[PDB]
């Protein structure tokens, strides 16, 4: 079998994860590659927003550790209205699941 013809650096993405979430919310709806690039850029953008906001929240209180509390305050600042009020519940439920899964 042919293998390793053209050495190209594997650019990471979120495409298979957005595909999994889409199959969890719509079991028959597909998505184009252009819209997949838009969803990948959206996840990168919101990741950079919440991470930079949590970095500023850590630097303001003279702390050099980003825990879930800095991410929670960054979410309460960045997401307007009900988006923060549901995302904080989803994140707290996930951290409660993660801490007591042993």
């Amino acid at each position: 079998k042919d293998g390793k013809k053209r050495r190209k650096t594997r650019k990471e993405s979120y495409a298979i994860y957005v595909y999994k979430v889409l199959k969890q919310v719509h079991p028959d709806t597909g998505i184009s590659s252009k819209a997949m690039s838009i969803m990948n850029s959206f996840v990168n953008d919101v990741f950079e927003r919440i991470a930079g906001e949590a970095s500023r929240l850590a630097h303001y209180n003279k702390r050099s550790t980003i825990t879930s509390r800095e991410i929670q305050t960054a979410v309460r600042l960045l997401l307007p209205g009900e988006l923060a009020k549901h995302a904080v519940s989803e994140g707290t439920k996930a951290v409660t699941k993660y801490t007591s899964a042993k």
Binding site: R56, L57, Y60, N61, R69, E70, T73, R76, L77
Partner: protein
């Protein structure tokens, strides 16, 4: 008593601010409108300014929380942080 502090912003206060803004004539419906907008402009700051005070585990909203809440919304204010 605990409801009419939006009317604590008076008609001559909005008159003086619009004279500074270069407005020659003000209609009678401006004063109900501006008290709305200013109120919204306080909320979008104070919702942030309490939230930094939440994360610092304090109860006092300092001037640094106001400067950071304005810097977040692209309204960087000078002369209150050392």
């Amino acid at each position: 008593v605990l409801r009419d502090n939006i009317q604590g912003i008076t008609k001559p206060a909005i008159r003086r601010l619009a004279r500074r803004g270069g407005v020659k004539r003000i209609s009678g419906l401006i004063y109900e409108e501006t008290r709305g907008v200013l109120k919204v402009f306080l909320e979008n700051v104070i919702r942030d300014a309490v939230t930094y005070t939440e994360h610092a585990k304090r109860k006092t909203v300092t001037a640094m929380d106001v400067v950071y809440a304005l810097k977040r919304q692209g309204r960087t204010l000078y002369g209150f942080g050392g």
